[PDB]
Symmetry: D2
Subunit: 281 residues, 4 copies
């Protein structure tokens, strides 16, 4: 199975597909090794790893090359965060094929306007979604529409009307996001979702909602961990930099770290040893 | 003081300058906040963050743009790892000015051959060093020669002859590296080093050697922590990915992580709020 | 004089500054040698050289690196086309400093909306312009506001109100564009322009308007040749590809071409010979 | 037929395949329209378009992205110039797959050393060639070995021994180059070439040798026009910049140029009109 089929196969089969965030290939590799179904090429995480606000500051090609870098590193499907398409349907049409070519198996686009109506018009986004499905070469590539209506405070009625409108435009799945610190809003949506396609959750704000709780929701097809990679990294590097400057060295801290040999193994040293062995003459 | 002056000022003043590794701008920012004197734009760390062996696999422009990204993020000096210059003196001449323009305050180049004599000839490297000092625009930019003779097993006599030869070619500082798991080899070198310029240590293999032990060595001007950033990151992301897949969620793990608000603050949200406030009209 | 001063000096002095389009460094070099005052880092030309419509398809970093490439090649000032700022004032604030750092001496931004009101609101653009002038480090860097009102068909009254509004927001110069195949519209504007800053023309559609005719217009400070580089290139490569395939070889066509030695000289072979001579040891 | 099959099919079929140089996608597009069999992603041309000596100055990723840009623009096969592999067999192993992924249907690598033995050892290059054929995913991707022995002055005997050694290592075709201003050296080689694979010519120095003369040589499978694109461009831009500065305008020169509408058509405006028409809602 190609990555696109692996992904599509998970959606059609009914399992719950788990996707972990990743701001670089090594991190994506570790997620693969930890057993997630796929990687999340988060715009937030990458812009965070660059110390820049997540407001379309990072160049679009910066995200694209990172996606290329990751897809060529892992064997599991990659879902790319392309925000709002970098423009209108025209931009979407030229963009999507580049992501598909970088190796992503799906892309996520939201109906928010660019730049900071909080959202674009329904018919306008339907058009941006149709442009996406048309632009793709392999029918397996998944296109996920992201409804930001709840975040907007437009209401549940409008959120479902958008999700349904997007589904009719050709969206393969719907990512519905919620602000509330309680997963009441999200659940309410799931329960009333009438559309035929799978839903996507990014339960970052309501960490009380487990995979078991989401698996219980037949309508949710994918779960996405949106920013734990960068958070895990920040928390640990920060603490280790504090210990080094408090201890005035790395005599106490070295022991608690992965060894250098472990980093070389994650770099793909084995593959390199075979190459050197059979071709370096 | 410009970054180049800050660095040069530390070398002339006699303090011990501490440099921490960094594979991305956020990590570099955290090092700055932890109080290191400067950042180390490590080739090992970056190629590691890309899951590729550190054997000149990563494109030279990949390292260059990361250095540009970091220098524009931190206010402290950046020392760039340019390996062996990406070729000969000609390559060195065209390369150095690009690094200086990305914003690095120094570059580190080694006398190893490319690709895998383990080393290049003395006169050849002297020439690559002279080409570097000539190519630089601001005389403050620091050029550090890296003697790999100990690693080569050519001996102490040859290591000092190289370091001295490089110093006469114009090298501002000498990075001398050692394999031994004990800092016996390194110390021996320091003690017999007759050259007039400052020495650089990257005590990664002998973590028993503290900053106090190195400060005791009047001849060492800079200490470099070569790969603790990527190791700290790997160790923590790995553990958090294991917990999530063992717990089947992030209900237990979320509490132990830096919050999302903390990541937004590190992204430079404050600067962005002021901009939006005064210019978004 | 730094490039920024050279440019600013031309604006304050009253001469007419000529800027030629360029889609790559070699072409920019040739323009310098032909004697233009500066280079025009055209979005149209670059997207054209990439066979893509000029509708914000090319990545923003693609244009940025080309500008970096050109500024490091020529010694004359470079004016970068940044279209509409790649977003709103926030985007403008983060963007401008990158262009200034690539080496551009000025940037041109237009009040058209993104993506396809044909224009943004006056106060909104004023804000995008103020964000630009605030974001710049060297006060000499020039910020040029581009009024697209005539193109919009909003009228002369509105075009001058925008140009004046932009000037009060801090715009150093005003680029006013016209559709008409006759330079009647443009002239009318110039004559009625009351603002204190210099005007910019890109007389591409009305080629009957010479530099003498524009020099006659005391209010115009800069003349820009918008797309003759790419047109000159297309016309000649096309003809030479036709001759080769019609002649079944390059026996007839080789004579009419610049020699290979001439291309090596434009590559900077002389500088390379000196480097090899003094540092390749 | 995929591009790789189109190429391979030309080699097996016995026709003479013509390849034209190209330093950017538009130029490559024009070559396609002029009817060449394929494009030549020349390192010389690209480094020339950047005003830098062709001595491995341009970043490897700079060439790679240009190849990606071109392959996504044309429908005919692209042959990428990868020089000497950017290192040894290890570098070759990691590199080739990136070029294959950018979309190239073949790569050309030479047995010259890096950086400036003029050549590497026979067994060493055999190894670099075997590493290339092993690294490729689609068996159709073509690997072309480039023998620089004549240029080296090692002689004909040694040139054929290399070409044969490379063929046994798995090289699909042999590019043999000559200095002489007369095609005597080249012909001599062709006549004595005993190997089973097709030969490649880049008759740049002996323009008296037509496609008919080369078609007469049953052993030559591909003809490559190495630098006429950049030469054609330089000659015309130079002349047009001279006329503009001599005429003090573009009133005389505009008439002799391709129109702006013609450039928009080459940018793919038609495709964009359809997209805007069916998806911009
Ligand atoms: Cl990273
Ligand atoms: Cl990165
Ligand atoms: Cl070009
Ligand atoms: Cl280009
Ligand atoms: Na990153
Ligand atoms: Na990284
Ligand atoms: Na170009
Ligand atoms: Na080019």
């Amino acid at each position: 199975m190609t990555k696109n089929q692996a992904l599509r196969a998970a959606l059609d089969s009914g399992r719950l597909f788990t996707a972990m965030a990743a701001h670089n290939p090594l991190v994506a590799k570790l997620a693969e090794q930890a057993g997630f179904g796929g990687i999340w090429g988060s715009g937030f995480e990458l812009s965070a790893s660059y110390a820049v606000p997540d407001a379309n500051i990072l160049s679009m090609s910066t995200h694209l090359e990172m996606m290329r870098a990751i897809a060529s590193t892992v064997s599991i499907p990659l879902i790319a965060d392309i925000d709002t398409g970098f423009g209108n349907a025209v931009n979407v049409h030229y963009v999507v094929p580049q992501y598909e070519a970088a190796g992503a198996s799906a892309i996520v686009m939201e109906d928010k306007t660019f730049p900071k109506q909080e959202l674009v018009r329904i018919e306008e986004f339907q058009g941006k979604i149709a442009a996406a499905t048309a632009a793709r070469a392999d029918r397996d590539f998944v296109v996920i529409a992201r409804v930001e209506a709840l975040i907007a405070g437009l209401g549940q009625q409008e959120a479902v009307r958008r999700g349904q409108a997007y589904e009719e435009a050709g969206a393969d799945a719907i990512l519905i996001h919620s602000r509330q610190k309680t997963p009441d809003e999200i659940l309410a949506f799931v329960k009333s979702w009438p559309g035929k396609v799978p839903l996507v959750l990014v339960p970052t704000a309501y960490p009380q909602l487990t995979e078991a709780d989401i698996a219980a929701l037949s309508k949710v097809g994918i779960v996405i961990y949106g920013n734990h990679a960068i958070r895990a990294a920040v928390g640990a590097v920060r603490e280790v930099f504090a210990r080094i400057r408090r201890d005035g060295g790395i005599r106490e801290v070295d022991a608690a770290l992965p060894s250098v040999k472990e980093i070389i193994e994650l770099q793909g040293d084995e593959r390199m040893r075979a190459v050197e062995a059979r071709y370096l003459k």
